[PDB]
Symmetry: C3
Subunit: 159 residues, 3 copies
Amino acid sequence: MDFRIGQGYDVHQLVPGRPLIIGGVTIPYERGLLGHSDADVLLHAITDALFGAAALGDIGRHFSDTDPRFKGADSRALLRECASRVAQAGFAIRNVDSTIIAQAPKLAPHIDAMRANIAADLDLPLDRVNVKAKTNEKLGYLGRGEGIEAQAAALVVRE
Amino acid sequence: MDFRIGQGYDVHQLVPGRPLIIGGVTIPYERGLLGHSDADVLLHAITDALFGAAALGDIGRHFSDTDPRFKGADSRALLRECASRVAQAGFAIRNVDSTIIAQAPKLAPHIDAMRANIAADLDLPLDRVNVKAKTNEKLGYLGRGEGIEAQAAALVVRE
Amino acid sequence: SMDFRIGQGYDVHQLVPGRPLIIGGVTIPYERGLLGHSDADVLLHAITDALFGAAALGDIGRHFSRFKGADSRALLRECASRVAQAGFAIRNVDSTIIAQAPKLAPHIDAMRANIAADLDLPLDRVNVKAKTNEKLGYLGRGEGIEAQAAALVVRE
Ligand SMILES: Nc1ccc(S(=O)(=O)Nc2ccccn2)cc1
Ligand SMILES: Nc1ccc(S(=O)(=O)Nc2ccccn2)cc1
Ligand SMILES: [Zn+2]
Ligand SMILES: [Zn+2]
Ligand SMILES: [Zn+2]
C-alpha cells in the first residue's frame, strides 16, 4: 500500500540530418532528434518519471555523458538500468502512461511497437504501459516541427 | 489495490467566430477554440488521462478527428463514452485533477461549473474532481493568447 | 487507508533583472531572478498547486490571491496545513524544474531538504529533477523558468 507517483518531461530539437527514434522505434522522417545518443525523448521522460517515483533523483544524476559504463548506451539500455535501480530501491512498477507531442509525422502506426519495447524493458504486462500521441495544433516550436516533447507518469509501490 | 495513473495534455488555437467551450461551459467571449469537435481542451485532456490510466490508448484512437460523426461533437458526450469504456475495461475512477492555462478570458467565475460538469459526466462527487486555472505569466503563444492549454491527471483502480 | 488521490501542478515565471533567483527555497547566484507577487518560487508554487489539486481544494489563485509579504515556503506550509485540514496525508511529491540556465544540480539536494521540512516528509518521499529546454522557446532563450509537480495523498 506504499504507493508513489513520478512524473517526467523531455524535449529534443528536430532538424534534418539525424534519425527519428521514439520509444525505441526508428521512424522514417525528413528530420530527427538531436541529443547525446539516440535522443529518445519518450524513453527519457519515462526514465525520469520512474526515478522520480522512487525519489532517486533523475536521469542526469544516474547516467552522466562521461561515465564509461554508459558511453554507447542507447535509451532502452538506460531504461532497463533505471528499472533495475528502482527495483533495488524496493519499488515495483505498477503502470506507465505517456504523451508524445509532435506536429509530424503521424505516430499512431508505431504506438504498439513503442508499448511493446517499453513493457519489455520494464518487465511489465503490456496492459500496464500506455503511449498517447498528438500534435500541437501548429503552435510554438512544437507546432512548427522544431522539437518533439514527451510527458510521462509512473505509479510504483514499495514492497 | 490495483491502482493506475494517467496523464493528459491538450491545446487548441483561439480564433474568432467559434464558441468558447471549456469544461462543458459555454463562456461569453469574442473568440473560441478551433477544432473538429467543440474543441473543449479541458475535457479532451481529462479524456486522455482516463484512457491513459486504463491503458486504452488515447482520444484520437477512440474518437478520430477525421470522422465526420464527430464534427462539432459535444465533448461531454465524448467524456461520458470514455468513462463508459474505462468502466468496461474494469476500472473505477478515483479522482481527477486538471489545469487550464489561458491569458484570457478570466476563468475563475466558471471553474465551479466546470468541476460540476466533469463530476456529473464521470459519476463522481464534487470532492473527487479538481480544476485549476492560471495564466502563463505573459510567456509564449499562451501569453499572446493564441491558444489555450489544458493538463490533467487521473487515478483509477481496476476492480 | 486506501483512498488515494493524485494532483498535478504547473507554474512558470519570467526571469527579470534586479531580483533574487529563489527556487525550492534556495537562493541561487544569477544575474536575474523570477518575477512574481511573492518571491516567485516557481517550484514551490507548482508543488503547492499539485497538493491543492490532489486534495480537491482548488488552486493557489483561490487560496492566496494576511499573506501580502509571505515567502513561498510559508505558503507551502499553509498549503500543507489546509491539505491536512481536509483529512489528507501527503504520501510523496515529484517535480521537474526546466531552466536553460543557471545550473541547478548543486542546489537540488537543498531544495529537496527544504520541501521535505515544509511538508513534514522524510527525504525519501520528496524528489526534484532539473532539465534544460534544449534552447527551444522562451524557456530555451532564458526568458522564464518552468516547474512541474505531481503529488500523491491519501484520505485517512
Ligand atoms: N472525436 C473528436 C474529438 C476531438 C476532436 S478535436 O480535433 O476538436 N480535438 C482533439 C483531437 C485529438 C486530440 C485532442 N484533441 C475531434 C474529434
Ligand atoms: N499568494 C500569492 C502567491 C504567489 C503569487 S505569484 O503571482 O508570484 N505566483 C503564482 C500565482 C498563482 C499561481 C501560481 N503562481 C501571487 C500571490
Ligand atoms: Zn532526452
Ligand atoms: Zn482537443
Ligand atoms: Zn507562481
